[PDB]
Design a protein around this ligand. Structure first.
Ligand SMILES: [Mg+2]
Ligand SMILES: [Mg+2]
Ligand SMILES: [Mg+2]
Ligand SMILES: [Mg+2]
Ligand SMILES: [Mg+2]
Ligand SMILES: [Mg+2]
Ligand SMILES: [Mg+2]
Ligand SMILES: [Mg+2]
Ligand SMILES: [Mg+2]
Ligand SMILES: [Mg+2]
Ligand SMILES: [Mg+2]
Ligand SMILES: [Mg+2]
Ligand SMILES: [Mg+2]
Ligand SMILES: [Mg+2]
Ligand SMILES: [Mg+2]
Ligand SMILES: [Mg+2]
Ligand SMILES: [Mg+2]
Ligand SMILES: [Mg+2]
Ligand SMILES: [Mg+2]
Ligand SMILES: [Mg+2]
Ligand SMILES: [Mg+2]
Ligand SMILES: [Mg+2]
Ligand SMILES: [Mg+2]
Ligand SMILES: [Mg+2]
Ligand SMILES: [Mg+2]
Ligand SMILES: [Mg+2]
Ligand SMILES: [Mg+2]
Ligand SMILES: [Mg+2]
Ligand SMILES: [Mg+2]
Ligand SMILES: [Mg+2]
Ligand SMILES: [Mg+2]
Ligand SMILES: [Mg+2]
Ligand SMILES: [Mg+2]
Ligand SMILES: [Mg+2]
Ligand SMILES: [Mg+2]
Ligand SMILES: [Mg+2]
Ligand SMILES: [Mg+2]
Ligand SMILES: [Mg+2]
Ligand SMILES: [Mg+2]
Ligand SMILES: [Mg+2]
Ligand SMILES: [Mg+2]
Ligand SMILES: [Mg+2]
Ligand SMILES: [Mg+2]
Ligand SMILES: [Mg+2]
Ligand SMILES: [Mg+2]
Ligand SMILES: [Mg+2]
Ligand SMILES: [Mg+2]
Ligand SMILES: [Mg+2]
Ligand SMILES: [Mg+2]
Ligand SMILES: [Mg+2]
Ligand SMILES: [Mg+2]
Ligand SMILES: [Mg+2]
Ligand SMILES: [Mg+2]
Ligand SMILES: [Mg+2]
Ligand SMILES: [Mg+2]
Ligand SMILES: [Mg+2]
Ligand SMILES: [Mg+2]
Ligand SMILES: [Mg+2]
Ligand SMILES: [Mg+2]
Ligand SMILES: [Mg+2]
Ligand SMILES: [Mg+2]
Ligand SMILES: [Mg+2]
Ligand SMILES: [Mg+2]
Ligand SMILES: [Mg+2]
Ligand SMILES: [Mg+2]
Lengths: 271, 27, 46, 94
RNA sequence: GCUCGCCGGAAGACCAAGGGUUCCUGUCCAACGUUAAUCGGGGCAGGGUGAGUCGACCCCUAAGGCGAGGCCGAAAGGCGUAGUCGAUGGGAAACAGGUUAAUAUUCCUGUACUUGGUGUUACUGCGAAGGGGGGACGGAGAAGGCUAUGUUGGCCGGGCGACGGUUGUCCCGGUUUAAGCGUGUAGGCUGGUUUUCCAGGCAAAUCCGGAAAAUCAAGGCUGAGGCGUGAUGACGAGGCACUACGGUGCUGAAGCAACAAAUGCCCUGCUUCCAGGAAAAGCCUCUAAGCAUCAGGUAACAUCAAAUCGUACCCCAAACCGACACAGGUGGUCAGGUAGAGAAUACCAAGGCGCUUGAGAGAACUCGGGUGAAGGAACUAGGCAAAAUGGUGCCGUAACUUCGGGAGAAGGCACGCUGAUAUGUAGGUGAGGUCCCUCGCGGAUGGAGCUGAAAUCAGUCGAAGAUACCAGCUGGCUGCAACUGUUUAUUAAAAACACAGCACUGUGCAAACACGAAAGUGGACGUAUACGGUGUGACGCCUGCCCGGUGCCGGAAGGUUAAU
RNA sequence: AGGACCGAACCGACUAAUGUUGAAAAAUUAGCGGAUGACUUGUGGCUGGGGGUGAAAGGCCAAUCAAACCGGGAGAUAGCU
């Protein structure tokens, strides 16, 4: 539920919360946690590789089953939890043999439902079965690219992938970007859309709400000196040049894909 | 002490002087 | 005002000490220069 | 068992002082200048053997050497070690 | 030595870092000390730092470093696995009193505690580099229960007043006591217990987790404080004696209660929110190979051991960083009284200082302040600076608005003391007493005593009652920027940057991109509701025409065109 | 509840005066802003010079920055003084 905040202060004037009351108001399941130390956008050389990253609230990592290998064994959904590491809510499930895991929560999933992976799985939202077992025209998520590697596609809050075709070993997918991609037909996929679809409906309201998320401020390039940026300089506001990166690469329109390895898997690019 | 003189010279010039004291560009 | 030397022996020895000099190649060349010049105190290290 | 040669090289000298005279007459404790590497057990064995007297406990401290100036040339005296040796009651020593 | 003045959330006390003998005693005054110096953080000599419990070391790990092999690289070398280092964090245990010229939770007295050993005695499943549990964790807020501590009363000892009065509703001082051990309270959490089974926890498992069934609602965990003991003790105002007048010795009264009360404790709690809040060991437990009555395990008792290093002194400073005995800078801990909302401010206590040149005189001028006739911004670039306002409670308060604000709008009234209501009220606290009880740190009742606002009425004093310190000037028009923030350390704090938001565009994951000759790493343990770049810069109404130029995208028939 | 309000600690540095061989190689006095947050602070760590970092002033990188410091090429060159 999106909740517009009352303007008792600037910084709450434009805030839209996304309140989900079904989430567990307690600590997460401890065995599935691990340390996630922050980086600052800095590599093993210590240099900043990707900018604007730093700070933010401390976050513990939740181990999430993307491979989804507990085949045949049904699992009931114990509770839904918040994951700070990602946009989608996660579900704590309990298998029959006593194993608990975290999965990505689908859209209509609630506490108490039964899910089941494997080939002999039914077709309801939550189940995971190979796309040679999945009917054409269905929306799936958490899609593997390679078999047994784990789901890599459609993991964000409201996403889904349509299955448009199948030719033997391959199925053709309609990705959320509009790209049509071939995937092997033995790769697992999970039924239904991912949960928190109204995640993009939030408004942070203020700058601190981005600093909570570790997003340091972005200096636009023309507000600099020419040694710093190509856009920099001018006596006033001057920009008489084509828009480039900080490293002198055209941004407005210039393509950067240079993978001739995966071009056979791309049916059509996005438009 | 010319060593305390070393201090004297080494850094009564490294004090660096502040600067001219008339905001005048004779421009 | 706050001046530029705020001492700490631990940081002094980790940064400029003997084993920090002997760790790397260039640090070993420093000790060879100071022995050749004939320094009494070869390093910081007491 | 500590060897007798080490026990003979542990003790250096008695330390005469007002605090030493007080501790000798009140707490029955002698104050010794000992070798620097000497431990408390080595001291207790040495006093129990070379003086033939019963040691209750040994307290130790390290004396830092002073920095002196002979003429105008700087110099530093040696660090030495000091032992408060508490004898049992009734025991006596010169 | 007597006065005076200053700090007193410090200009007092304890530490860390850092320094490194500056500590104490004797002696000296050449130099140092912004003067003299008999003095000194100065010179010279001597002395002084005592730990099983404090800290370090040590066991454990974080960020991160190193890194066998390894991968990569002209060489040097780079990264990094197993590992091994690395605190600022986790991990056993001691308190009170006395004492030195100088050390003390270290010595002494008293009373404790912890972990390892060996050794007997009983008992008998022991065992890990492995499994599980625990350690183990956020912000804010609300109270409640307490204590530290303070005040008053009581008690004891002393006093009866340099000047009117003061045997009393008078004055002064004291009224301290720990760790530990026992009790397990206010209060918080939790359903217990038994049996059977089980694709899980890399194998196993009696453990955890999960399925069943039965029985019992009542067991368990945690837990400040209190009480008792510790303690017939110690301390104790004072006295009694000697006195090197410094001291040392002996003796020693009362040692209670009520109220108020923390930012400290219960509280690593409870509630709530979103931005979703370290690890590992110690500890507990489970079994594996192994061992089979041996080894080992816990239980008691005894005994032994607990090493080594630091400990002096300054530590918001004359001892640290500033070249100085420099108006600078420096992290943590303690937090008395009166007034006060208060850690502000004023005066004081404990305690510590009077800032290492003074003496005069009382010109101009300068510095920092005080007051000012009449006028009241006429000054000036400009009301710069000054002056003024200033508190609590109540009344009342405009345009406009994003309906929150504006707004403390503006403006105004009251404010002291005494008495009465009421010899001190409402309220708070809560005793005795009585009753009940599955009986205790219990439950009712009860109201003593203590504490104690605020209001009204009457009176009264002064020029003035928020009397001192403290403590908003206000309003009107308008430009810019939405806002809070940031910035040129050392002439620029702004209209500049950032910002939430908007849009374009790239990117399908071995992502783009970026650092790297490379390996690799970040992005990201993320996957297009994501990430990067660019521009704009809340919100509201909007964002029009031009693709000729320059770019970019798409095209591939033709022309031209490289190495070969 | 709040990048909410007033306001000490704390952080900062808007104005004026002093001072300018200073008490001080940027401070004092009187006022000033924020003051539960994009806060601040201790300890330790990492990023290295055409490189870092930068809420971007060409700011900061040991009182030094339109390319640090030290040593070396090196007695650079100097139609200039
Ligand atoms: Mg960015
Ligand atoms: Mg932006
Ligand atoms: Mg920007
Ligand atoms: Mg600029
Ligand atoms: Mg350029
Ligand atoms: Mg222009
Ligand atoms: Mg133009
Ligand atoms: Mg002892
Ligand atoms: Mg010691
Ligand atoms: Mg005097
Ligand atoms: Mg005073
Ligand atoms: Mg000396
Ligand atoms: Mg002295
Ligand atoms: Mg002396
Ligand atoms: Mg003289
Ligand atoms: Mg003199
Ligand atoms: Mg001296
Ligand atoms: Mg340890
Ligand atoms: Mg590591
Ligand atoms: Mg390495
Ligand atoms: Mg190697
Ligand atoms: Mg280690
Ligand atoms: Mg530590
Ligand atoms: Mg002392
Ligand atoms: Mg474990
Ligand atoms: Mg927390
Ligand atoms: Mg009390
Ligand atoms: Mg009188
Ligand atoms: Mg009289
Ligand atoms: Mg009294
Ligand atoms: Mg007790
Ligand atoms: Mg001390
Ligand atoms: Mg002090
Ligand atoms: Mg002085
Ligand atoms: Mg000073
Ligand atoms: Mg006070
Ligand atoms: Mg004050
Ligand atoms: Mg005068
Ligand atoms: Mg005046
Ligand atoms: Mg006048
Ligand atoms: Mg007048
Ligand atoms: Mg005029
Ligand atoms: Mg005028
Ligand atoms: Mg003014
Ligand atoms: Mg004024
Ligand atoms: Mg105008
Ligand atoms: Mg602004
Ligand atoms: Mg600043
Ligand atoms: Mg800054
Ligand atoms: Mg400036
Ligand atoms: Mg300024
Ligand atoms: Mg990668
Ligand atoms: Mg702009
Ligand atoms: Mg346009
Ligand atoms: Mg065009
Ligand atoms: Mg083209
Ligand atoms: Mg605020
Ligand atoms: Mg000021
Ligand atoms: Mg404020
Ligand atoms: Mg410029
Ligand atoms: Mg500088
Ligand atoms: Mg350079
Ligand atoms: Mg250059
Ligand atoms: Mg040459
Ligand atoms: Mg030359």
């Amino acid at each position: 539920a999106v909740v517009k905040c009352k303007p008792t202060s600037p910084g709450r004037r434009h805030v839209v919360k996304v309140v989900n009351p079904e989430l567990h108001k307690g600590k997460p399941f401890a065995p599935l946690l691990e340390k996630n130390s922050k980086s600052g956008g800095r590599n093993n050389n210590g240099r900043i590789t990707t900018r604007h990253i730093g700070g933010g609230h401390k976050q513990a990592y939740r181990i999430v089953d993307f491979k989804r290998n507990k085949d045949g064994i049904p699992a009931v959904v114990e509770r839904l939890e918040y994951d700070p590491n990602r946009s989608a809510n996660i579900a704590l499930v309990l298998y029959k043999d006593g194993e608990r895991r975290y999965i990505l929560a689908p859209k209509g999933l609630k506490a108490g439902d039964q899910i089941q992976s494997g080939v002999d799985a039914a077709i309801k939202p939550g189940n995971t079965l190979p796309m040679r077992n999945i009917p054409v025209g269905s929306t799936v998520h958490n899609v593997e690219m390679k078999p047994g590697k784990g789901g890599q596609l459609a993991r964000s809050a409201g996403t889904y992938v349509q299955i448009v075709a199948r030719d033997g070993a391959y199925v053709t997918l309609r990705l959320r970007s509009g790209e049509m991609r071939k995937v092997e037909a033995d790769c697992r996929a999970t039924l239904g859309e991912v949960g928190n679809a109204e995640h993009m409906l939030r408004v942070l309201g203020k700058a601190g709400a981005a600093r909570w998320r570790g997003v340091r401020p972005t200096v636009r390039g023309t507000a600099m000196n020419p040694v710093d940026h190509p856009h920099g300089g001018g006596e006033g506001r001057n920009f008489g040049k084509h828009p480039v990166t900080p490293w002198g690469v055209q941004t407005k329109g210039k393509k950067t894909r240079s993978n001739k390895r995966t071009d056979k898997f791309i049916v059509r690019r996005r438009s | 002490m010319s060593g305390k003189m070393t201090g004297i010279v080494k850094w009564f010039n490294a004090d660096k002087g502040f600067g001219f004291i008339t905001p005048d560009d004779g421009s | 005002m706050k001046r530029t030397f705020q001492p700490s022996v631990l940081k002094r020895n980790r940064s400029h000490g003997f084993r920090a000099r002997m760790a790397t190649k260039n640090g070993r060349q420093v000790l060879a220069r100071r022995r050749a010049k004939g320094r009494a105190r070869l390093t910081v290290s007491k | 068992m500590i060897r007798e040669e080490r026990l003979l090289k542990v003790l250096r000298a008695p330390h005469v002082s007002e605090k030493a005279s007080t501790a000798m007459e009140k707490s029955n404790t002698i104050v010794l200048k000992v070798a620097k590497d000497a431990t408390k057990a080595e001291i207790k064995a040495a006093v129990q053997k070379l003086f033939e007297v019963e040691v209750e406990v040994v307290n130790t401290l390290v004396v830092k050497g002073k920095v002196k100036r002979h003429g105008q040339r700087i110099g530093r005296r040696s660090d030495w070690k000091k032992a408060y040796v508490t004898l049992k009651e009734g025991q006596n020593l010169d």
